[PDB]
């Protein structure tokens, strides 16, 4: 990749201008290498574990295509990250299945979309989330999944950790990238759904946060 600024001071990555960006955080190559390295850590961690056997009604059995790792992906920010991560988990041979939940704030938390999996009791569950910032969203999701599904173990993998944003204790078990204490965009991160399709992650110019006020 080539990262530079044009004559207007605008960041250009591979010939493409990003006038909404303050700084580049990570190119696609760095992001993908970071995700694949975490996929290897996740596969190495879960491959030797056993949990409730729901395929044979038996007691306990190794993680397998019969009894896969349960992954709950948090929409919408995690969908692109999850699509890439599952393919790397497959490269490393980790048996797994994915369902989705969505949460939002009104700030207080509320579930927008429930998972449809119904047999998570005694299973290993991994949450895939886009970013840990204040820690409030993941505190809410972990408490809810833990009490409603009663999994054997519950862990979190984030694409991004913004360390300085913490207001409640939260350190995901797996972290692909560390980002600056700024609003990030690209690769699933957005402003009113814009910028999600970027292959790179950037910080946002402060004046751009209210650029698209109209609800979709």
Ligand X SMILES: O=c1[nH]cnc2c(CN[C@@H](CO)CCP(=O)(O)O)c[nH]c12
Residues 75-94 that bind ligand X (CB under 6 A): 77
Q: Name the minimum Å distance from CB 116 to ligand X.
A: 15
| DSSP state string for 54-98 | SSSS-SEEESSSSSPEEEEEEETTTHHHHHHHHHHHHHTT--EEE
Tell how far CA 68 is from the center of its chain.
Answer: 19
Binding of residue 203 to its own copies (CB under 8 A)? no
Element (H, E) at 126: strand 124-132
Q: Is 133 a catalytic residue?
A: yes
> Which residue, chain included where needed, has tokens 């038996």?
58
Q: How far is CA 216 from CA 73, 118, 193, 194, in A?
A: 23, 32, 9, 11
Which CB sits closer to ligand X, 152 or 191? 191
Map the footprint of ligand X across residues 123-162, applying CB under 6 A: 130-138
Binding-site partner at residue 136 among its own copies, ligand X, none, CB < 5 to 8 Å by type: ligand X
Stretch near its own copies under the rule CB under 8 A, chosen from 4-12, 133-141, 172-180, 191-199: 191-199
Closest by CA position to 103, among listed 78, 70, 69, 125: 78
- For the window 109-128, what string marks contact with its own copies as x by the rule CB under 8 A? ---xx--xxxx---------
Binding flag, residue 22, ligand X (CB under 6 A): no
Instruction: For 42, list phi and psi in degrees, rounded to 5.
Output: -60, -50
Instruction: Find the catalytic residue in 84, 130, 133, 161.
Output: 133
C-beta of 149: minimal distance to ligand X in Å?
Answer: 20
What track of x and - describes contact with ligand X for positions 36 through 75 (by CB under 6 A)?
A: ----------------------------------------
Q: How many other C-beta atoms can be found within 10 angstroms of the C-beta atom of residue 16?
A: 10
Q: Are strands 50-52 and 60-62 parallel, antiparallel or unpaired?
A: antiparallel
CB of 61 to ligand X, least distance (A): 26
From 18, 46, 100, 202, residue interacting with its own copies (rule: CB under 8 A): 100
Q: Which residues bind ligand X (CB under 6 A)?
A: 77, 130-138, 183-184, 189
Active-site amino acid positions: 133
């Amino acid at each position: 990749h080539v990262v530079s600024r044009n004559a207007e001071g605008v960041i250009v990555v591979d010939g493409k201008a990003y006038p909404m960006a303050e700084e580049l955080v990570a190119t696609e190559s760095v992001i993908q290498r970071s995700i694949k390295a975490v996929a290897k850590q996740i596969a190495d961690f879960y491959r030797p574990l056993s949990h409730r056997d729901t395929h044979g009604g038996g007691g306990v059995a190794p993680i397998s295509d019969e009894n896969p790792l349960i992954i709950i992906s948090v929409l919408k920010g995690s969908y692109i990250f999850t699509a890439d991560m599952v393919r790397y988990l497959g490269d490393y041979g980790l048996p797994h299945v994915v369902d989705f939940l969505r949460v939002a704030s009104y700030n207080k938390m509320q579930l927008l979309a429930e998972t449809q999996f119904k047999a998570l009791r005694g299973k290993h569950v991994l949450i895939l989330e886009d970013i840990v910032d204040s820690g409030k969203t993941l505190r809410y999701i972990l408490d809810k999944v833990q009490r409603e599904h009663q999994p054997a173990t519950l862990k979190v993998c984030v694409l991004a950790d913004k360390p300085g944003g913490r207001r409640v204790t939260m350190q995901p078990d797996f972290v692909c990238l560390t980002v600056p204490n700024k609003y990030v965009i690209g690769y699933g991160f957005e402003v009113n759904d814009r910028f999600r399709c970027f292959r790179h992650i950037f910080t946002l110019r402060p004046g751009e946060a209210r650029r698209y006020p109209a609800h979709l």
